[PDB]
Design an enzyme around this catalytic site. Structure first.
Site, PDB file in Angstrom:
ATOM      1  N   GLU A 190       9.049  11.699  -1.612  1.00 29.53           N
ATOM      2  CA  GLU A 190       8.342  12.946  -1.921  1.00 29.53           C
ATOM      3  C   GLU A 190       6.870  12.622  -2.216  1.00 29.53           C
ATOM      4  OE1 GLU A 190       9.880  14.467  -5.461  1.00 29.53           O
ATOM      5  OE2 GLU A 190       8.697  16.233  -5.460  1.00 29.53           O
ATOM      6  N   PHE A 191       5.968  13.434  -1.711  1.00 31.29           N
ATOM      7  CA  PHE A 191       4.533  13.168  -1.903  1.00 31.29           C
ATOM      8  C   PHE A 191       4.011  14.052  -3.028  1.00 31.29           C
ATOM      9  CE2 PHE A 191       0.434  15.020  -0.175  1.00 31.29           C
ATOM     10  CZ  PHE A 191      -0.365  14.156  -0.864  1.00 31.29           C
ATOM     11  N   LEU A 192       3.441  13.454  -4.063  1.00 27.03           N
ATOM     12  CA  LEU A 192       2.881  14.233  -5.191  1.00 27.03           C
ATOM     13  C   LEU A 192       1.366  14.333  -4.995  1.00 27.03           C
ATOM     14  CD1 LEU A 192       4.938  14.910  -7.696  1.00 27.03           C
ATOM     15  CD2 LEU A 192       5.680  13.387  -5.907  1.00 27.03           C
ATOM     16  N   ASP A 239       8.505  -0.329 -15.784  1.00 25.82           N
ATOM     17  CA  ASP A 239       7.083  -0.204 -15.417  1.00 25.82           C
ATOM     18  C   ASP A 239       6.533   1.119 -15.914  1.00 25.82           C
ATOM     19  OD1 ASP A 239       4.897  -1.423 -14.370  1.00 25.82           O
ATOM     20  OD2 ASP A 239       5.430  -1.114 -12.359  1.00 25.82           O
ATOM     21  N   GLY A 246       9.705   0.161  -8.446  1.00 27.41           N
ATOM     22  CA  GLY A 246       9.627  -1.180  -7.842  1.00 27.41           C
ATOM     23  C   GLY A 246      10.055  -2.291  -8.784  1.00 27.41           C
ATOM     24  N   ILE A 256       0.852  -1.181   0.000  1.00 31.53           N
ATOM     25  CA  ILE A 256       0.000   0.000   0.000  1.00 31.53           C
ATOM     26  C   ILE A 256       0.891   1.236   0.000  1.00 31.53           C
ATOM     27  CG2 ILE A 256      -1.799  -1.238   1.271  1.00 31.53           C
ATOM     28  CD1 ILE A 256      -1.105   0.453   3.709  1.00 31.53           C
ATOM     29  N   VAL A 257       0.259   2.396  -0.168  1.00 28.94           N
ATOM     30  CA  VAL A 257       0.950   3.681  -0.166  1.00 28.94           C
ATOM     31  C   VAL A 257       0.151   4.650   0.692  1.00 28.94           C
ATOM     32  CG1 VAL A 257       1.777   5.618  -1.543  1.00 28.94           C
ATOM     33  CG2 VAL A 257       1.980   3.290  -2.427  1.00 28.94           C
ATOM     34  N   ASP A 297       7.232   4.868  -9.222  1.00 27.26           N
ATOM     35  CA  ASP A 297       7.125   3.390  -9.163  1.00 27.26           C
ATOM     36  C   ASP A 297       8.323   2.659  -9.765  1.00 27.26           C
ATOM     37  OD1 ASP A 297       6.140   0.972  -8.518  1.00 27.26           O
ATOM     38  OD2 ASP A 297       4.238   1.211  -9.445  1.00 27.26           O
TER      39      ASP A 297
HETATM   40  C1  GCC Z   1      -2.860   1.888  -8.530  1.00 28.42           C
HETATM   41  C2  GCC Z   1      -1.534   2.353  -8.234  1.00 28.42           C
HETATM   42  C3  GCC Z   1      -0.944   1.893  -6.925  1.00 28.42           C
HETATM   43  N1  GCC Z   1       0.126   2.824  -6.761  1.00 28.42           N
HETATM   44  C4  GCC Z   1       0.189   3.762  -5.643  1.00 28.42           C
HETATM   45  O1  GCC Z   1      -0.692   3.634  -4.960  1.00 28.42           O
HETATM   46  C5  GCC Z   1       1.304   4.743  -5.486  1.00 28.42           C
HETATM   47  C6  GCC Z   1       1.169   6.060  -5.148  1.00 28.42           C
HETATM   48  N2  GCC Z   1       2.305   6.623  -5.093  1.00 28.42           N
HETATM   49  C7  GCC Z   1       2.447   7.894  -4.819  1.00 28.42           C
HETATM   50  C8  GCC Z   1       1.372   8.673  -4.896  1.00 28.42           C
HETATM   51  C9  GCC Z   1       1.527  10.018  -4.638  1.00 28.42           C
HETATM   52  N3  GCC Z   1       2.713  10.477  -4.348  1.00 28.42           N
HETATM   53  C10 GCC Z   1       3.716   9.699  -4.295  1.00 28.42           C
HETATM   54  N4  GCC Z   1       4.981  10.291  -3.987  1.00 28.42           N
HETATM   55  N5  GCC Z   1       3.619   8.427  -4.510  1.00 28.42           N
HETATM   56  C11 GCC Z   1       3.241   5.713  -5.405  1.00 28.42           C
HETATM   57  C12 GCC Z   1       4.595   5.845  -5.505  1.00 28.42           C
HETATM   58  C13 GCC Z   1       5.359   4.721  -5.838  1.00 28.42           C
HETATM   59  C14 GCC Z   1       6.877   4.828  -5.944  1.00 28.42           C
HETATM   60  C15 GCC Z   1       8.021   4.947  -6.002  1.00 28.42           C
HETATM   61  C16 GCC Z   1       9.532   5.032  -6.056  1.00 28.42           C
HETATM   62  O2  GCC Z   1       9.996   3.898  -6.675  1.00 28.42           O
HETATM   63  C17 GCC Z   1       9.908   6.245  -6.853  1.00 28.42           C
HETATM   64  C18 GCC Z   1      11.388   6.516  -6.843  1.00 28.42           C
HETATM   65  C19 GCC Z   1      11.936   6.587  -5.436  1.00 28.42           C
HETATM   66  C20 GCC Z   1      11.572   5.348  -4.634  1.00 28.42           C
HETATM   67  C21 GCC Z   1      10.100   5.052  -4.656  1.00 28.42           C
HETATM   68  C22 GCC Z   1       4.770   3.519  -6.089  1.00 28.42           C
HETATM   69  C23 GCC Z   1       3.426   3.395  -6.013  1.00 28.42           C
HETATM   70  C24 GCC Z   1       2.668   4.539  -5.655  1.00 28.42           C
HETATM   71  C25 GCC Z   1       1.075   2.731  -7.819  1.00 28.42           C
HETATM   72  C26 GCC Z   1       0.370   2.977  -9.110  1.00 28.42           C
HETATM   73  N6  GCC Z   1      -0.661   2.037  -9.274  1.00 28.42           N
END
Ligand code: GCC
Length: 292
Positions: free
Chosen positions: A97-99, A141, A161, A35-36, A159
């Site tokens: 960082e949070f977008l 990805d 990952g 989760i995030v 992402d």
């Molecule tokens: C349906 C979705 C499920 N997802 C999410 O819920 C995600 C939401 N965020 C958000 C959202 C807002 N702000 C931020 N900063 N992150 C995600 C960030 C990452 C990531 C990453 C990194 O690898 C980037 C490089 C540095 C190390 C970490 C991965 C997943 C999510 C993914 C998309 N499909």
């Protein structure tokens, strides 16, 4: 072994228990292995993003090493910044960082972007990809879900990952990794591959931005992969008029032969990217703004 994996992971992550300096966790996403959350740095009130991966649920563990190692200290205008990584119980936590703007997926599945908007996204991704490819980093990805936006419309690649690192000595990967609909054909065919798979995945995301969904998105994932493997390079089905530059642009990305597919540094010079609008042209598309 699980504890064997947790022990090796503890060597590469930062030390500490991050639940001390973070609180107010708000879940905002689920990825089938994790989760995030939005979290608050207790010492400053600033918001960060924290993603938690269930270690017990990883089909293949080495991928978690890739992200925490490759992305530590990485700084780019178009890439989401990882602040720290920690081992917490049976979870890997990535503090980043949070977008606040959210993902590009929400924009593409609700409205059709104009060429100026599509060009702006392409340019931001290609700038990030050209810097990453030069250092041997393959994202693996690239899709609309992996694109995050600021509140004012800045594009940031997210992402990592599924990312990987290649070198002059081992210049290609071979893992079956990615999201089936955006996967490059050489990857689906289980051939060795390099950074060119991201260029194909980008081409599928262009089809996302024009058509709203990738090709074969109605089909189950395994069916879509068989079709990507055996069918001719898709062109836009969203048959509403497209400029020739966009048409020529997509013809450089969706090339079955990776050796003939244009590189990131080659595409930065393509005439389609001249259409790129400012970050503000993305803003009206976001959910918080498009109904006002
Ligand atoms: C349906 C979705 C499920 N997802 C999410 O819920 C995600 C939401 N965020 C958000 C959202 C807002 N702000 C931020 N900063 N992150 C995600 C960030 C990452 C990531 C990453 C990194 O690898 C980037 C490089 C540095 C190390 C970490 C991965 C997943 C999510 C993914 C998309 N499909």
């Amino acid at each position: 072994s699980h504890e064997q994996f947790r022990a090796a992971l503890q060597l590469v992550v930062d030390p500490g228990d991050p639940r001390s300096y973070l609180d107010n966790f708000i879940k905002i996403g689920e990825g089938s292995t994790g989760i995030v959350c939005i979290a608050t740095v207790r010492s400053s009130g600033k918001l960060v993003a924290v993603k938690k991966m269930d270690l017990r649920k990883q089909q293949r563990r080495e991928l978690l090493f890739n992200e925490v190692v490759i992305m530590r200290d990485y700084q780019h205008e178009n890439v989401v910044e990882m602040y720290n990584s920690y081992l917490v119980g049976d979870e890997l936590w990535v503090v980043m960082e949070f977008l606040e703007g959210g993902a590009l997926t929400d924009i593409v599945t609700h409205t059709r972007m104009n060429e100026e908007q599509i060009a702006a996204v392409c340019l931001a991704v290609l700038q990030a990809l050209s810097v990453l490819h030069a250092q041997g980093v393959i994202h693996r990805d690239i899709k609309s879900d992996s694109i995050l936006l600021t509140h004012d419309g800045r594009v940031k690649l997210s992402d990592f990952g599924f990312c990987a690192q290649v070198s002059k000595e081992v210049p290609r990967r071979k893992s079956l990794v990615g999201t089936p609909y955006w996967m490059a054909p050489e990857l689906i065919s289980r051939l060795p591959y390099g950074p060119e798979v991201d260029i194909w995945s980008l081409g599928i995301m262009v089809i996302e931005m024009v058509d709203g969904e990738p090709p074969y998105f109605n089909e189950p994932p395994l069916k879509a992969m068989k079709m990507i493997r055996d069918n001719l390079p898709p062109r836009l089905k969203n048959l509403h008029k497209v400029s020739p530059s966009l048409k020529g642009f997509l013809d450089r990305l969706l090339v079955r032969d990776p050796a003939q597919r244009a590189t990131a540094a080659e595409l930065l010079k393509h005439p389609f990217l001249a259409k790129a609008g400012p970050p503000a042209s993305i803003v009206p598309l976001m959910r918080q703004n498009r109904t006002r």
